[PDB]
Design an enzyme around this catalytic site. Structure first.
Site, PDB file in Angstrom:
ATOM      1  N   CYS A  30       4.137   0.716   9.655  1.00  0.00           N
ATOM      2  CA  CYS A  30       3.973  -0.326   8.650  1.00  0.00           C
ATOM      3  C   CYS A  30       5.326  -0.714   8.067  1.00  0.00           C
ATOM      4  CB  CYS A  30       3.031   0.137   7.538  1.00  0.00           C
ATOM      5  SG  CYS A  30       1.323   0.404   8.070  1.00  0.00           S
TER       6      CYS A  30
ATOM      7  N   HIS B 280       0.807  -1.216   0.000  1.00  0.00           N
ATOM      8  CA  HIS B 280       0.000   0.000   0.000  1.00  0.00           C
ATOM      9  C   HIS B 280       0.842   1.270   0.000  1.00  0.00           C
ATOM     10  CE1 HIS B 280       0.507  -0.436   4.479  1.00  0.00           C
ATOM     11  NE2 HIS B 280       0.663   0.871   4.368  1.00  0.00           N
TER      12      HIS B 280
ATOM     13  N   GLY C  57       3.450   5.368  10.588  1.00  0.00           N
ATOM     14  CA  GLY C  57       4.776   5.105  10.074  1.00  0.00           C
ATOM     15  C   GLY C  57       5.368   3.771  10.475  1.00  0.00           C
TER      16      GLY C  57
HETATM   17  C1  LIG Z   1       0.951   2.117   8.292  1.00  0.00           C
HETATM   18  O1  LIG Z   1       1.978   2.738   9.013  1.00  0.00           O
HETATM   19  C2  LIG Z   1       0.689   2.896   7.004  1.00  0.00           C
HETATM   20  O2  LIG Z   1       1.711   2.654   6.076  1.00  0.00           O
HETATM   21  C3  LIG Z   1      -0.341   2.108   9.108  1.00  0.00           C
HETATM   22  C4  LIG Z   1      -0.108   1.505  10.494  1.00  0.00           C
HETATM   23  C5  LIG Z   1      -1.347   1.968  11.488  1.00  0.00           C
HETATM   24  C6  LIG Z   1      -1.371   3.175  11.601  1.00  0.00           C
HETATM   25  C7  LIG Z   1      -1.816   3.532  13.217  1.00  0.00           C
HETATM   26  N1  LIG Z   1      -1.474   2.543  13.953  1.00  0.00           N
HETATM   27  C8  LIG Z   1      -1.112   1.390  12.981  1.00  0.00           C
HETATM   28  O3  LIG Z   1      -0.749   0.299  13.270  1.00  0.00           O
HETATM   29  N2  LIG Z   1      -1.329   1.338   8.375  1.00  0.00           N
HETATM   30  C9  LIG Z   1      -2.572   1.971   7.970  1.00  0.00           C
HETATM   31  O4  LIG Z   1      -2.775   3.106   8.246  1.00  0.00           O
HETATM   32  C10 LIG Z   1      -3.614   1.183   7.181  1.00  0.00           C
HETATM   33  C11 LIG Z   1      -3.497   1.614   5.720  1.00  0.00           C
HETATM   34  C12 LIG Z   1      -3.280   0.439   4.768  1.00  0.00           C
HETATM   35  C13 LIG Z   1      -3.809   0.828   3.388  1.00  0.00           C
HETATM   36  C14 LIG Z   1      -4.018  -0.805   5.253  1.00  0.00           C
HETATM   37  N3  LIG Z   1      -4.942   1.540   7.633  1.00  0.00           N
HETATM   38  C15 LIG Z   1      -5.416   1.242   8.968  1.00  0.00           C
HETATM   39  O5  LIG Z   1      -4.723   0.691   9.753  1.00  0.00           O
HETATM   40  C16 LIG Z   1      -6.830   1.667   9.346  1.00  0.00           C
HETATM   41  C17 LIG Z   1      -7.752   2.250   8.483  1.00  0.00           C
HETATM   42  C18 LIG Z   1      -8.895   2.487   9.189  1.00  0.00           C
HETATM   43  C19 LIG Z   1     -10.274   3.122   8.762  1.00  0.00           C
HETATM   44  O6  LIG Z   1     -10.463   3.554   7.443  1.00  0.00           O
HETATM   45  C20 LIG Z   1     -11.546   4.422   7.261  1.00  0.00           C
HETATM   46  C21 LIG Z   1     -11.378   3.259   9.778  1.00  0.00           C
HETATM   47  C22 LIG Z   1     -11.161   2.795  11.173  1.00  0.00           C
HETATM   48  C23 LIG Z   1      -9.839   2.190  11.565  1.00  0.00           C
HETATM   49  C24 LIG Z   1      -8.692   2.052  10.495  1.00  0.00           C
HETATM   50  N4  LIG Z   1      -7.416   1.547  10.582  1.00  0.00           N
END
Ligand SMILES: *[C@@](O)(CO)[C@H](C[C@@H]1CCNC1=O)NC(=O)[C@H](CC(C)C)NC(=O)c1cc2c(OC)cccc2[nH]1
Ligand SMILES: *[C@@](O)(CO)[C@H](C[C@@H]1CCNC1=O)NC(=O)[C@H](CC(C)C)NC(=O)c1cc2c(OC)cccc2[nH]1
Ligand code: NA
Ligand code: NA
Ligand code: NA
Ligand code: NA
Ligand code: NA
Ligand code: NA
Ligand code: NA
Ligand code: NA
Lengths: 305, 302
Positions: free
Chosen positions: B145, B41, B143
């Site tokens: 991920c 992603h 950050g």
């Molecule tokens: C990565 O760092 C992004 O590269 C991120 C890790 C999370 C961020 C906060 N704490 C973590 O572990 N991953 C994400 O942000 C992912 C994005 C990819 C495409 C899967 N998204 C989520 O974790 C996420 C999205 C949503 C949402 O929508 C609308 C609604 C509610 C919860 C939620 N979590």
């Protein structure tokens, strides 16, 4: 999100762990530049540790009686000296993996990462807190002596603990990297008792700020207190009194939440007097006291090194 | 003596952590030999992450579109493929700090060490367990991920997790190193719920054995139960069933303490029906289930 007990990345310390052996007595040592630091009782036999005279025992030892090994590679000892309860062994090779480092003596309640080591090889890493009675609730077995505790600040590793002994109660005691023991313990094969332990108040308050940051703030009351009045009340509940440094290091968490330090103290005082009333904080019914204000800030801000 | 949640030394993994940037999206990557593994992603924009057609988005990307940085040094991407939710960036330089490694998929209940990273720099290390609903209870922020989970055996690092997502409930989800998610989750920007989170029963029993080894005995009783009678009560409290495999794995802990497994099961049954009142076990007010029998034996054998 989430709040976990986090240790520092141990790579910079792993490259400094070596094995030190005198006769059949073996433990871990810390190899920084061309000096290896280890507990002085490595020069003792099993019977010597019962009632040792370290000055007498060391005077019979020469440089060639010390076996220092980085893995299976021997580092020739070219000099030795005693400093309090730590033996300093100059070696013929400067450690190329030596990081920027410092020797620091931490305060009770301060946390650090412990790199558990056996026969000079790291086995695990975990976070400890120096209890107010100068013990640590760690996990140490035979051969773990010489394992170090540390904090990492940017590119600098601040070494603060070296393991020496386990108390009968199952807790552990050691020294700083200058060989000075934390608390009233001595490096001798004897059953030694630690003082009555207390709860680390500055860490509980930091944990409370962490809950407020995460939206859990039901415990905030409309009361305030003075630092002296709170310190007297806290001691009645076996809680540690706060120092000026404690109030200072709580500053960033107070500014981030808008909750004055003395206001949080009064809220904690009510939690001690009346209890939690069947409620939880950050999911836990227990007041966690092994998270420093730095640990709360470092975890919530994603600080790297 | 003593028992603590402990993670493997992370040095072998720290030397593989790099920073991957594509457009305005930045996360962590795993640098093994001349391949950098990171969540796919990273190629998405704000509008893409809503409903990303990853095959369509990846084909439209070039090698120069990805900025890979290992510390100061910038690694030139000379190739790019994708395996499920993991993007694979080939680079012109092999990582000299590449340890002996393997890609494995762990089972629910097993544990692993997480090296949390931000912008390619390691920030902390802690132990996680793969819960039966295939989530993990970690500490990941923006950050993070690309951070990986692993186990180390001898000199071999067995990679088993790469972080992708935090669920609305605060728990976390990710993939193995082949890009296959643990659980019914998808790498899209949507609120996703997991299945009911059950308790790892074999881990609670091992943790109770660790408490007895360390002087905690207040929860023991004189009673014994059968395997089926315990599982009936365990399932009633959303505990995973205990198999004969689990009973055998607990063997060394049972022989060391002299408490039969079925004897420990009767103690756990009383804890589920009566609670712990106000007492604690190994400093915890809840029944811990993130310690495997191997984690207890490896820490309490002596
Ligand atoms: C990565 O760092 C992004 O590269 C991120 C890790 C999370 C961020 C906060 N704490 C973590 O572990 N991953 C994400 O942000 C992912 C994005 C990819 C495409 C899967 N998204 C989520 O974790 C996420 C999205 C949503 C949402 O929508 C609308 C609604 C509610 C919860 C939620 N979590
Ligand atoms: C070192 O590894 C030895 O080099 C060892 C580490 C402890 C042993 C097991 N778990 C540990 O943390 N340290 C010791 O064995 C020290 C020896 C030196 C002289 C400090 N001794 C103890 O830890 C110790 C001795 C005694 C005792 O006597 C009799 C009675 C009760 C408790 C006790 N602990
Ligand atoms: Na007193
Ligand atoms: Na809310
Ligand atoms: Na008074
Ligand atoms: Na009281
Ligand atoms: Na004091
Ligand atoms: Na504010
Ligand atoms: Na080409
Ligand atoms: Na080609």
């Amino acid at each position: 999100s989430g709040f976990r007990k986090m240790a520092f990345p141990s790579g910079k310390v792993e490259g400094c762990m070596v094995q030190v052996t005198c006769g059949t007595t073996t433990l871990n040592g810390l190899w920084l530049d061309d000096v290896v630091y280890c507990p002085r009782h490595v020069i003792c036999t099993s019977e010597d540790m019962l009632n040792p005279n370290y000055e007498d025992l060391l005077i019979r030892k020469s440089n060639h009686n010390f076996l220092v090994q980085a893995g299976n590679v021997q580092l020739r000892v070219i000099g030795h000296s005693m400093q309090n309860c730590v033996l300093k062994l100059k070696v013929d090779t400067a450690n190329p993996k030596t990081p920027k480092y410092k020797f620091v003596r931490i305060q009770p309640g301060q946390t650090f990462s412990v790199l558990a080591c056996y026969n000079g090889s790291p086995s695990g890493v975990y976070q400890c807190a120096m209890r107010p009675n100068f013990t640590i609730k760690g996990s140490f077995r035979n051969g773990s002596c010489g394992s170090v505790g540390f904090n990492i600040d940017y590119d600098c590793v601040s070494f603060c603990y070296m393991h020496h002994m386990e108390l009968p109660t199952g807790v552990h005691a050691g020294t700083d990297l200058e060989g000075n023991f934390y608390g009233p313990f001595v490096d001798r094969q004897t059953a030694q008792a630690a003082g009555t332990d207390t709860t680390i108040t500055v860490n509980v308050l930091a944990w409370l700020y962490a809950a407020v940051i995460n939206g859990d703030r039901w415990f905030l009351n409309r009361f305030t207190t003075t630092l002296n009045d709170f310190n007297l009340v806290a001691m009645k509940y076996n809680y540690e009194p706060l120092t000026q440094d404690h109030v200072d290091i709580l500053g960033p968490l107070s500014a981030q939440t808008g909750i004055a330090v003395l206001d949080m103290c009064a809220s904690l005082k009510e939690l001690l007097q009346n209890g939690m009333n069947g409620r939880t904080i950050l999911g836990s019914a227990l007041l966690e006291d092994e998270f420093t204000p730095f640990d709360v800030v470092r975890q919530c801000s994603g600080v790297t090194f």
